[PDB]
């Protein structure tokens, strides 16, 4: 055969893979956490968007910390041999390195470790994408007027916000990040490599959104998403 190159992940397996969407809206009163109005818009938008990309979407709502772990554990024990990749979207409250279950926090590392190259052999060498809409702290951006592989390899963390910062969600239109992500995926999934699509998402969130609040502390704030890539190849959602 002619000359071959291996710069992009093989995405022509029989199935694109699973897209797990965890949507936490209602939290146990004892946690003292507010409901996340608008998150359902995000969940439906993501379901439709990934359905169009040919992913097997599974939506889960209001899962406890224990349920999140067991779900991730069970999913990682499935046979992904015939799947090209894996996607997990987390919509909830959070802080740096933490996602919140309805009854308490969950370490992100605990969730992702189940998919390590040595713990999920059917996903070894395949892109594992974690999309996270949740706060990573309490900082506010005031803006300015213009043959072995690593077990941590092949992971991509698409964070809605910069390390240490709050993440914004509109109770009517949904989160800034998820709204933008779905829009960019719908428009460029057939045209651009994933990192370039995410860069477009960064630009959209950074330029088209600004908070409005009667509280001066939270008014006129900006946001920049954060792409954290440990991928080893280019990722295209199309093939052939």
């Amino acid at each position: 055969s002619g000359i071959s190159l291996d710069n992009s992940y093989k995405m022509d397996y029989p199935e694109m893979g699973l897209c797990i969407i965890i949507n936490n809206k209602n939290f146990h009163k004892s946690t003292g956490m507010t409901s996340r109005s608008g998150t359902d818009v995000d969940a439906a938008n993501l379901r439709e968007t990934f359905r169009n990309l040919k992913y097997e979407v599974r939506n889960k709502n209001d899962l406890t910390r224990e349920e999140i772990v067991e779900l991730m554990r069970d999913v990682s024990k499935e046979d992904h041999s015939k799947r090209s990749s894996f996607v997990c979207v987390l919509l909830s409250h959070g802080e740096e390195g933490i996602i919140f279950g309805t009854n308490g926090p969950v370490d992100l590392k605990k969730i992702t470790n189940f998919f390590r190259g040595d713990r999920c052999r059917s996903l070894t060498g395949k892109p594992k994408l974690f999309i996270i809409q949740a706060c990573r702290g309490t900082e506010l951006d005031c803006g300015i007027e213009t043959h072995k592989i690593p077990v941590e390899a092949d992971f991509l963390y698409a964070y809605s916000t910069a390390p240490g910062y709050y993440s914004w969600r509109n109770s009517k239109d949904g989160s800034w990040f998820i709204q933008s992500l779905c829009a960019m995926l719908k428009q460029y999934a057939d045209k651009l490599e994933f990192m370039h699509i995410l860069t477009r998402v960064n630009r959209k969130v950074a330029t088209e959104f600004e908070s409005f609040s009667f509280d001066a502390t939270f008014h006129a704030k900006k946001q920049i998403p954060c792409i954290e890539s440990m991928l080893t190849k280019e990722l295209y959602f199309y093939h052939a």
Binding site: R36, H93, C135, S167, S175
Partner: peptide, 4 residues
């Protein structure tokens, strides 16, 4: 607009 609200925070997560």
């Amino acid at each position: 607009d609200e925070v997560d």
